[PDB]
């Protein structure tokens, strides 16, 4: 049952005008500014916007913009101006707050705040306490976030209002933040779930770029970080931090793009407490320095990543030009494989400490620090399989090496080859190898050392025997051990166990004694 | 009774533009002289003059409103209330069926159909199946289809309207599927090329959470599946078939979570017909148990992984509390590179019956079951190079092992040592090798133990040989092969082949004979 | 329940125009002035005001309206039809052109151009010359550029206006160009940092199919790329230049489909200057060739992957059907990793000329070209660690090789075993190595041959000394090298040094001189 009544200006109006309203009463707003022609209809004791009464254009029209406008919250309905003049931070906090939803999975509420193109300028830090919410712009760069924040703040800080529970689902795509070099924070994670941000740039903080509190779960596809950190107050370009009751596990860059940081491009921290960060990874990224006229130039002595966790996945990444290590490994089964390391002043991998289990494989690159090496000699068993210039060792763990010695391919243990040197990682340890040649004067050798002492210094290497086309040539003694005369074969020196004599079994079977003078 | 559509020049245009009107079609025109801002309402077979306006701003609004409708197809414009109460299933399928489209490419035809924020209670199964058709939500949990489906159906059924043909360029992103626990399929795919799904969610289905079918070329990011499947009727988080005709090929499922499925997180049936499922790849994917607290606990008994297929790939994935193999083979030349295993009831990596040349690089992992290894030792030839806590062989293929022979670097042939004991694999066959240390009684060794006729037994290692600073030390014999007298240097012991007698050419040339009694 | 009249000038007019009003009988009344756009229902038996046109409110209503146009410049605001028959050239051109932009970074300026599903016919080059432009459309088919340019111009050139600059933060997302078999280029890109790329196709080019010349830092994730070039045109599926400036580098190609192209599918070229080609990257990427159904078959003559370039990542990627080599390198350090290789006339590797430190790893496959394999034997070092079907080498680098010699375990200087021949590499060199068997005739056998005079020459290996359960075996003499009798432990047998003399040291401590006749 529809019945009409006179239409009102506004909806204000409605109460006034009708204070005691009964069932299928329909009225239509005729001079309420931007919802003139929305048409209202009394039922259950409240007044309800209703689709139904499309005959007038303007009535279609309002139908069909609520329609639309269910695809985004438009920063700009909350009154952002996006011209780098205006304060716009209050408007972007209200647009975000007008978003109803809750905490953890929060199903079916939620929604995308968009940011048209423009330049935001923030002078205070806004908060995204709720989940699905994410930030979307007109592009990385079309919609900028511009940055007067000089107390430390974030500029976007994602965090639970109940910090008991979780944040899920939350993200920023197509967007830049620039700090334009305030000491401000770009974007600040924690304890985020399931997070999903593409193609977004951090740039220009002079605290963390992106700081990172236990964070379960997040993919990150394209982000462009730069100029962010300080090393002289341990602020970096992502930190990754465990938090005091957790961990930071599953974060995923994919495609990312590091580039002139101040701090480390990435720098882990597990300290604290007891569960490290884990299973985390880099897939495809880029990790490229400060300064390419000079090492150290003005490049900051800080590694391009900094390592401490576990399980972490470092997948085909490109690494230039660092005053450090590439990467300072403490921690444990990281994986480090089909990298390419260019240019650095210490190891391409560090493995500090008590780090075990890492693995480098398929990796390559040129030009560690003088007189180092791709990779140092750790303390616990890592295992390699890679082929970098100026490194003998190609396959290895702890100190059981396969390697090109001069161009024989080498079997060593507890040594390697090292520009002309031969170091012994434990000096405490006597060292053995095989090395096969391809000319007929070395043939199959056979060498060895004592124990030099001292870890990582030099041996010289003796040649016990060389096994050649034309003799078995022992350069120490064949010393036997006594066996039975029934066990042996025709043609056979050997010592006889019976009665400790030198003995020949000659073709027909006969034992005979070897005379001796 | 009233849709409005686009505005047109004039009278003379209805019929041009308008070919079909139904009843209650309204339009007005805008640029008719006296005649403009009329409106005209489609009723008993003639369009009749309802309205006039005067400004016509309204007619501008109308068309900027046509414009920006192109972009998606809103569920809403069908009657849909995402309340979590109505039953939209109808509204949904009649905003799908909305989009006029073909089959195998369809060129210039399709689009997407926008889920808003909201819940959505679907109670049959909704079918896309023309090409072109993506569904899109605001947000993974944001947009949220709640099923009552209890007959095994799917929510969401992608499959050509005729199946000689291909359904291409479908998929669904920022939503998620909700099976509420009943025995329903969230999103079943068949027949389809060219898929694109994002940042999805299946989860909560009693049956297959998603099924696949003969699906080709298409990429899986970020998709979030957890609690599907039935482990006592075979329903799986993802059911990968390759059905009767051809297989299921080059899916890509990249960055994806599966956890605590109630079948395995991934199965491949290549039962349909001989051509098997293959090139199919999971890149930094999660594969998680049910129960952390213990294990078996509420594990359940099925891989994490069930692998009837060939030249899988899976990097960099991460595999956690599996009550059984975690990747179950049957197949050929998959790839299982830089993934990292915690903790199963069975091996890492199970290579069963036939299956060869796959491959397992760089991996790492603890905790693989009882008496058992990170993988088997398989029937036909396969290779590893990885290194694995408790597993001393570092790189091999079929019985040539590398390995850690207790602080040595071993080369073996049909012998590892596992523990304290060494295992000869194939009982059939002698085991030898040798082992270089770093202590001088050892030195280079060379080691043996005969056929023991049972494979994967028990045997004693034999010291053959062994290669020190102060001697070649044999334990057994020295068997000349008698040589011709002019073969030999300066300096030989030999046998002559002219007289089978021990003989030894001195420092000068002279060849006399070792005097035996 | 509702019956539209003819509208009526005045209220007024409504009794003098219809005298026998029924019930839900509705007309408006038009020029009443103030009053005009009145809606009047007769209810019961008045005519009774129920709704209204307010012409003043039309502005307001707009504001909501400007606010949904900020998503996207949408080219059909612009003219075009999108039915594939008029050209919409023009209006494509002004909607881009309207885009307010400038080069380099041009922060806070930009957007999308939005194009609806449809098809559109290009007829001349279209010009993208400022920063910060999208071109998105409604799906990878359901948005298509139907191309008639016939000049070798692109459909799309992506450029700076000023080429001191560069052009930044471009990207097309969700839309086909098809050349329908025209000589046009499908895509062009130059000068460009930054690019994002999501889901898009070129096929049907009979120029490249997407051309690039020195582009950085750019991410295309799921490019569909089929049916372009030209073998005897010397054009490819994509082309890759480095210019005469600088490079085209980190441009990363996620999840790519290549199929049946009529050039190569990627074809590096880096001859425009010395700066070559560098840090590319290929995740899960498909190559796949023309013609199944044989081999030549229809296949072009020439490599699904021309690498000239250094530093590329080839990860995981599958390689199908190539009547050429898969992979054709010229350059340094690539990384080809986990890899699959099904049926080619070449190698699925072929390193070129120079090719230094490129890495084979985790790769595998099936059907190299006959009488070749894997990968050549290359002029500098490289380094493989991979398991081919019918390829017996699994680890090597430069000469030295780790393989399977007839089941057994061989670490191999300068030789390696081919079917039933062993090859020798370099013939000036002779050949070393040990094998490690599995039976009591074999055990542990040192093998060697002279240097044949001819590279990959056909040599018979020497066995030189076997270590069994048995004995120590010498097919040569032992040849001592002449040492001092106190260093001899107990049963020794040494020349001693102080007079060249044979002798034993027995069981006592006593050296004792062996008599000789």
């Given at each position: 049952k529809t019945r009409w009544l006179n239409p009102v200006a506004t909806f204000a109006d409605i109460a006034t005008t009708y204070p005691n309203p009964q069932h299928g009463d329909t009225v239509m707003v005729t001079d309420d500014g931007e919802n003139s022609g929305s048409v209202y209809r009394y039922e259950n004791g409240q007044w309800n916007l209703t689709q139904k009464h499309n005959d007038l254009a303007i009535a279609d029209v309002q139908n069909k913009i609520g329609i639309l406008k269910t695809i985004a919250v438009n920063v700009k309905e909350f009154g952002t101006k996006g011209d780098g003049v205006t304060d716009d931070t209050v408007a972007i906090q209200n647009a975000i707050n007008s978003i109803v939803s809750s905490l953890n999975n929060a199903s079916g509420q939620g929604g995308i705040v968009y940011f048209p193109t423009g330049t935001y300028k923030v002078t205070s830090k806004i908060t995204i306490n709720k989940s699905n919410i994410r930030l979307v712009g007109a592009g990385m760069s079309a919609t900028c976030i511009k940055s007067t924040?000089?107390?430390?703040?974030?500029?976007?800080?994602?965090?639970?209002?109940?910090?008991?529970?979780?944040?899920?689902?939350?993200?920023?795509?197509?967007?830049?933040?620039?700090?334009?070099?305030?000491?401000?924070?770009?974007?600040?994670?924690?304890?985020?779930?399931?997070?999903?941000?593409?193609?977004?740039?951090?740039?220009?903080?002079?605290?963390?770029?992106?700081?990172?509190?236990?964070?379960?779960?997040?993919?990150?596809?394209?982000?462009?970080?730069?100029?962010?950190?300080?090393?002289?107050r341990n602020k970096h370009g992502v930190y990754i931090y465990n938090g005091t009751s957790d961990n930071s596990n599953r974060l995923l860059f994919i495609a990312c793009h590091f580039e002139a940081n101040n701090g480390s491009h990435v720098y882990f921290d597990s300290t604290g407490n007891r569960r490290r960060n884990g299973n985390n990874q880099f897939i495809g990224c880029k990790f490229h320095g400060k300064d390419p006229s000079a090492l150290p130039g003005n490049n900051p002595n800080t590694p391009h990543m900094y390592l401490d966790g576990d399980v972490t996945y470092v997948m085909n990444c490109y690494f230039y030009q660092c005053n450090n290590d590439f990467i300072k490994v403490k921690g444990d089964r990281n994986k480090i494989i089909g990298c390419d390391f260019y240019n650095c002043t210490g190891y391409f991998v560090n493995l500090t400490g008590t780090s075990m289990l890492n693995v480098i494989d398929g990796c390559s690159g040129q030009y560690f620090g003088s007189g180092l090496a791709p990779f140092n000699n750790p303390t616990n068993e890592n295992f390699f399989c890679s082929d970098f210039i100026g490194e003998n060792r190609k396959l290895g763990w702890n100190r059981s090496y396969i390697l090109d010695q001069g161009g024989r391919l080498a079997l060593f243990q507890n040594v390697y080859r090292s520009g002309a040197n031969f170091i012994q990682p434990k000096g405490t340890n006597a060292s053995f190898g095989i090395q096969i040649a391809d000319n007929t004067v070395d043939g199959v050798a056979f060498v060895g050392a004592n124990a030099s002492g001292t870890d990582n210094s030099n041996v010289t290497l003796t040649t016990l025997l060389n096994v050649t086309l034309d003799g078995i040539k022992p350069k120490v003694p064949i010393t036997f051990t006594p066996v039975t005369a029934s066990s042996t074969l025709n043609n056979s020196l050997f010592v006889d166990s019976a009665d400790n004599k030198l003995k020949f079994k000659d073709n027909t079977g006969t034992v005979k004694i070897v005379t001796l003078t």
């Open positions: 924040i000089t107390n430390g703040n974030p500029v976007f800080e994602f965090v639970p209002s109940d910090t008991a529970q979780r944040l899920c689902f939350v993200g920023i795509e197509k967007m830049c933040i620039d700090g334009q070099n305030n000491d401000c924070i770009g974007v600040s994670l924690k304890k985020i779930s399931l997070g999903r941000f593409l193609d977004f740039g951090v740039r220009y903080c002079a605290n963390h770029g992106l700081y990172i509190e236990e964070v379960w779960d997040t993919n990150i596809i394209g982000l462009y970080n730069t100029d962010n950190g300080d090393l002289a």
